[PDB]
Design a protein around this nucleic acid. Structure first.
Ligand SMILES: [Mn+2]
Length: 179
DNA sequence: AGC
């Protein structure tokens, strides 16, 4: 059922991200043509994770996000069994080899701390790091430790505001912000 | 995934 949002997603994000988002949705059996705001949110989340992992040095991060679920857990078990970090309850997005911790990255259309507290209580993990970005240029991270240098986080924030403008320009921001 |  032809939606403006679905075709917007396909210009905004590169094909590699679109294909991972589609696979993620149908691995858990949802339809990107129908659940189009969730389509847009998953592509957004994917892109931020990849931008984030590009912010470090060459070998800094293990990318968990974007793998099929069974392989992602395999890699997580490899990380826990070779480093001794406690196995997380939910699939994190990255592993930081420099700081020795998993990272859960989130993107929100609300005040970053509302979403942070939600992610904090969901993860019983005392140790996995949380880093939240908003669509208005705010961020929030565990212990005020933002992992990356300012430039790498700044370009993530710029991209998120561009996505917001592109949606608003198409009168999709309101549906998206209210979903 | 994030409202
Ligand atoms: Mn996440």
């Amino acid at each position: 059922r032809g939606s403006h949002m679905e075709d917007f997603v396909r210009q905004c994000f590169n094909p590699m991200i679109v294909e991972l988002a589609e696979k993620a949705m149908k691995e858990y059996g949802e339809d990107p043509k129908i659940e189009t705001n969730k389509f847009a949110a998953i592509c957004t989340h994917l892109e931020v994770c990849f931008m984030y992992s590009d912010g470090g040095s060459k070998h800094r991060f293990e990318i968990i996000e974007g793998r099929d679920r069974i392989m992602a857990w395999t890699v997580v078990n490899s990380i826990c069994n070779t480093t001794g970090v406690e196995k997380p309850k939910f699939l994190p997005d990255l592993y930081d080899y420099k700081e020795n911790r998993f990272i859960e990255i989130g993107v929100t259309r609300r005040e970053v701390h509302i979403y942070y507290l939600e992610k904090a209580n969901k993860i019983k993990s005392e140790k996995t790091h949380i880093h939240i970005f908003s669509f208005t240029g705010e961020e929030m991270a565990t212990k005020a430790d933002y992992t990356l240098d300012e430039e790498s986080r700044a370009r993530i924030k710029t991209r998120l505001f561009t996505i917001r403008q592109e949606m608003a320009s198409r009168s999709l921001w309101d549906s998206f912000r209210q979903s």
